[PDB]
Curated annotation (Swiss-Prot), chain A:
Gene for this chain: rep
Binding site for Zn(2+) 8: C117, C120, C128, C130
Residues bound to Zn(2+) 7: C74, C77, H83, C90
Record's protein name: Non-structural protein 10
Subunit and interaction comment: Forms a dodecamer and interacts with nsp14 and nsp16; these interactions enhance nsp14 and nsp16 enzymatic activities.
Classification of source organism: Viruses, Riboviria, Orthornavirae, Pisuviricota, Pisoniviricetes
Location within or outside the cell: Host cytoplasm, Host perinuclear region; Host cytoplasm; Host endoplasmic reticulum
Coiled-coil parts of chain: none
Organism for this UniProt entry: Severe acute respiratory syndrome coronavirus 2 (2019-nCoV)
Function: Plays a pivotal role in viral transcription by stimulating both nsp14 3'-5' exoribonuclease and nsp16 2'-O-methyltransferase activities. Therefore plays an essential role in viral mRNAs cap methylation.
ExoN/MTase coactivator domain sequence ranges: 1-131
From Swiss-Prot, chain C:
Domain Nsp9 ssRNA-binding residues, every copy: 1-113
Record-given protein name: Viral protein genome-linked nsp9
Species this chain originates from: Severe acute respiratory syndrome coronavirus 2
Gene: rep
Superkingdom of origin organism: Viruses
Record's signal peptide: none
Main function: Forms a primer, NSP9-pU, which is utilized by the polymerase for the initiation of RNA chains. Interacts with ribosome signal recognition particle RNA (SRP). Together with NSP8, suppress protein integration into the cell membrane, thereby disrupting host immune defenses.
Quaternary structure note: Is a dimer. Interacts with NSP12. Interacts with host SND1.
Range covered out of full length: 4141 to 4253 of 7096
Cellular localization per UniProt: Host cytoplasm, Host perinuclear region; Host cytoplasm; Host endoplasmic reticulum
């Protein structure tokens, strides 16, 4: 019973992240392994006004970028798999994620490759006055 | 189109505040207005929801070389025996809080085992998933009444995977550096596997040279199978898809096709053992193939050389004894003479001739009701042929199948599968084969001069203490040494004994006798 | 404190269609009880959108019955490839008793969505 969830078209994709124990390099090899992306990220909507900090309680966006959800942005939690998080789960579950226009195709590799900087709270390089 | 893959399992239908739902479908219709989601301050987010989630609909088949595609195709699982072991699991659904998920309860393989385990599952939580234990009940089907006493006595996952990888590490440790499974209905195995299994990069085992099929999570260590003790994961295993290889009905009635000896005591391991059995049939009940080899594990060349030398020796003895006018060979694939010098009428027969020298190998399928009253003249040859009743005269050697030999791998239907270099699907043993002869009587035959300083005849040849009146290797009267002969019998004795460790049994007809060799030696 | 009825209602396949003549010989699933009067029939099970008539040989096989069906009941069973739509017709004017025991044996046999 319950509620439906995943697309059968990306089944294989999540399959590679369901049975993997080195799932990070695994799924980046998958993004680069003869496939098209995980075509199901929650699509938010905002006025595109505010600072660039994606990790926000209520969408805090720029004119260029675009917001998806907070939770639907970590494959470690997108696949209900175990985590290497020390204690003991992933943070972005609960907020929002406003990714800048370029790299905003898939937020999984984004959340895993980049991570928020403590100075400006934005994604490191998009942009920052970090020297 | 929606998935049973990751399909929610609890009855609560209230959608998730999409900041707590990792997919664009698990959002309630309060946020989706023209395909877009709008943040709502009118209600805060929720922190009270503990729902298990389905783990079906996988169909794992990425395409990279950095992982080897675990599922092996038609041949790559037929070629590689010493790895075949069953895989099947029984499952159930929950009662109150949720339902709609499949979870394992008893696991059976080819090994005569059926593991008990309490059910647990991935409950969804506002922070991640938890691995929670939920009330369980078998399906309402009455044939699951046998499954009643299993839910209140099972086991968690940690100890279970330790014991399972250790059953592996003592039963399959003797066999292969991976592990392949037969499977009929692939689907429930797909659903059941995930709990103590993980994919990733196959690498190199810890302090060993095998491929790493073990994995730790507390340390991330990689064990083979002589070194998996408390290290509880199967990492790069294999399987063999039995179902999609020419079948129609279920595996039970298709076992009833040929495999009849397999009774049906109500267990679960029977399903996987019969999966292996029927996969064995639907590829190997036909003719033995000569293009397939195997690793040798082990000591096999000793058995091979002993078999060759003893076969040649016994044929030589029977020939030089009975003086056969004609020796009708049967089932010899390479047209060379076993005994080097034999003035006997030499033929060539088989149920399947070849190309060249088929002018030797005549077309004939023997049978006891057919060819019974023809080859009475001379004698035939029934070395490792597995037909019906042996005729009145024959030099025979049949694999007594019930023996213990860890290269024996049981199959269908009771008829054993011996794993040498060519896989022998040999028919089982019964008494109805040898009802015209008697088992092998011992002897020892030699017809060559000595090595000592005498050169000529008795008495100038050295006799050292050898006292045995059964090694008819004349000269023999209290000494019987001749150096080269005596010690050879020594070695030869070893030879004979070694054969009774394989399974091959030798029998020679009743009217054989010992004094013909004595009179042969009266020079 | 008062249990109803342990069952014994069998299920066969036979003929039904939309009109008196549209009934193909094999498309419907009869649920029935062989009472004093032959295999006395109770309900129909199908997958087709609608079947307003059915046809079944008699006790000895004289004629074919022309038993119409109910506006079918909607539900979904499960087959290894997901959900599957199914309808449960009843022979019209069949009181609550046999409707009930049929639902009993049926929901027992088939687990729904
Ligand atoms: Mg059974
Ligand atoms: Zn996470
Ligand atoms: Zn910064
Ligand atoms: Zn090792
Ligand atoms: Zn000698």
């Amino acid at each position: 019973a319950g509620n439906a969830t995943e697309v059968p078209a990306n089944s294989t994709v999540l399959s590679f992240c369901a049975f993997a124990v080195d799932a990070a390099k695994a799924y980046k090899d998958y993004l680069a392994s003869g496939g098209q992306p995980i075509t199901n990220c929650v699509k938010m909507l905002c006025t595109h006004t505010g600072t660039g900090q994606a990790i926000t309680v209520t969408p805090e966006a720029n004119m260029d970028q675009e917001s998806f959800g907070g939770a639907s942005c970590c494959l470690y939690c997108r696949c209900h798999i175990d985590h290497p998080n020390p204690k003991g789960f992933c943070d972005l579950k609960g907020k929002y994620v406003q990714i800048p226009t370029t790299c905003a195709n898939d937020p999984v590799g984004f959340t895993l490759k980049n991570t928020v900087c403590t100075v400006c709270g934005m994604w490191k390089g998009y942009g920052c006055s970090c020297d | 189109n929606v998935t049973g893959l990751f399909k929610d399992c609890s009855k609560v239908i209230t959608g998730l505040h999409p900041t707590q739902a990792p997919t664009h479908l698990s959002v309630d219709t309060k946020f989706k207005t023209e395909g877009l989601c709008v943040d709502i301050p009118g209600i805060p987010k929720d922190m009270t929801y503990r729902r298990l989630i389905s783990m079906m609909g996988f169909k794992m088949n990425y395409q990279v070389n950095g992982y080897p595609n675990m599922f092996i195709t038609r041949e790559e699982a037929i070629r590689h025996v010493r790895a075949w072991i069953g895989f099947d699991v029984e499952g159930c659904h929950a009662t109150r809080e949720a339902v709609g998920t499949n979870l394992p309860l008893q696991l059976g393989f080819s090994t005569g085992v059926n593991l008990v385990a309490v059910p647990t599952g991935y409950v969804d939580t506002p922070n991640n998933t938890d691995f929670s234990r939920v009330s369980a009940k078998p399906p309402p089907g009455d044939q699951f009444k046998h499954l009643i006493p299993l839910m209140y006595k099972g086991l968690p996952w940690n100890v279970v995977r330790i014991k399972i990888v250790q059953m592996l590490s003592d039963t399959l440790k003797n066999l292969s550096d991976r592990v392949v499974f037969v499977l009929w209905a692939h689907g429930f195995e797909l659903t059941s596997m995930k709990y103590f299994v993980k994919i990733g990069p196959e690498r190199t085992c810890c302090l060993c040279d095998r491929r790493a099929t073990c994995f730790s999570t507390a340390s991330d260590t990689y064990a083979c199978w002589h070194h998996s003790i408390g290290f509880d994961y199967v990492y790069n295993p294999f399987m063999i898809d039995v179902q999609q290889w020419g079948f129609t009905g279920n595996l039970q009635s298709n076992h009833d096709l040929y495999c009849q000896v397999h009774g049906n005591a109500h267990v679960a391991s029977c399903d996987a053992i019969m999966t292996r059995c029927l996969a064995v049939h639907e590829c190997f009940v036909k003719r033995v193939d000569w293009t397939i080899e195997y690793p040798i594990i082990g000591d096999e060349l000793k058995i091979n050389a002993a078999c060759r030398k003893v076969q040649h020796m016994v044929v030589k003895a029977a020939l030089l004894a009975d003086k056969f006018p004609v020796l009708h060979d049967i089932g010899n694939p390479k047209a060379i003479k076993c005994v080097p010098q034999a003035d006997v009428e030499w033929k060539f027969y088989d149920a399947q001739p070849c190309s060249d020298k088929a002018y030797k190998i005549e077309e004939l399928f023997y049978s006891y009701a057919t060819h019974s009253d023809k080859f009475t003249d001379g004698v035939c040859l029934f070395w490792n042929c597995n037909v019906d009743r042996y005729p009145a005269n024959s030099i025979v050697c049949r694999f007594d199948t019930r023996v213990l030999s860890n290269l024996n791998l049981p199959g269908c239907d009771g008829g054993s599968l011996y794993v040498n270099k060519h896989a022998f699907h040999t028919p089982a043993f019964d008494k109805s084969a040898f009802v015209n002869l008697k088992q092998l009587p011992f002897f020892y035959y030699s017809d060559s001069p000595c090595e000592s300083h005498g050169k000529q005849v008795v008495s100038d040849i050295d006799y050292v203490p050898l006292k045995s009146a059964t090694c008819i290797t004349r000269c023999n009267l209290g000494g019987a040494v001749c150096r080269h002969h005596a010690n050879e019998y020594r070695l030869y004795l070893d030879a004979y004994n070694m054969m009774i460790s394989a399974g091959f049994s030798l029998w020679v007809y009743k009217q054989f006798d010992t004094y013909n060799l004595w009179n042969t030696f009266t020079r | 404190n008062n249990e109803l009825s342990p069952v014994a209602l069998r299920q066969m396949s036979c003929a039904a269609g939309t009109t008196q003549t549209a009934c193909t010989d094999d498309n419907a699933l009869a649920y029935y009880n062989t009472t004093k009067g032959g295999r006395f029939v109770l309900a129909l099970l199908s997958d087709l959108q609608d079947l307003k008539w059915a046809r079944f040989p008699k006790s000895d096989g004289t004629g074919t019955i022309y038993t119409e069906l109910e506006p079918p009941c909607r539900f979904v069973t499960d087959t290894p490839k997901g959900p599957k739509v199914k309808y449960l017709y009843f022979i019209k004017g069949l009181n609550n008793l046999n409707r009930g025991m049929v639902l009993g044996s049926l929901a027992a046999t088939v687990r729904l969505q």
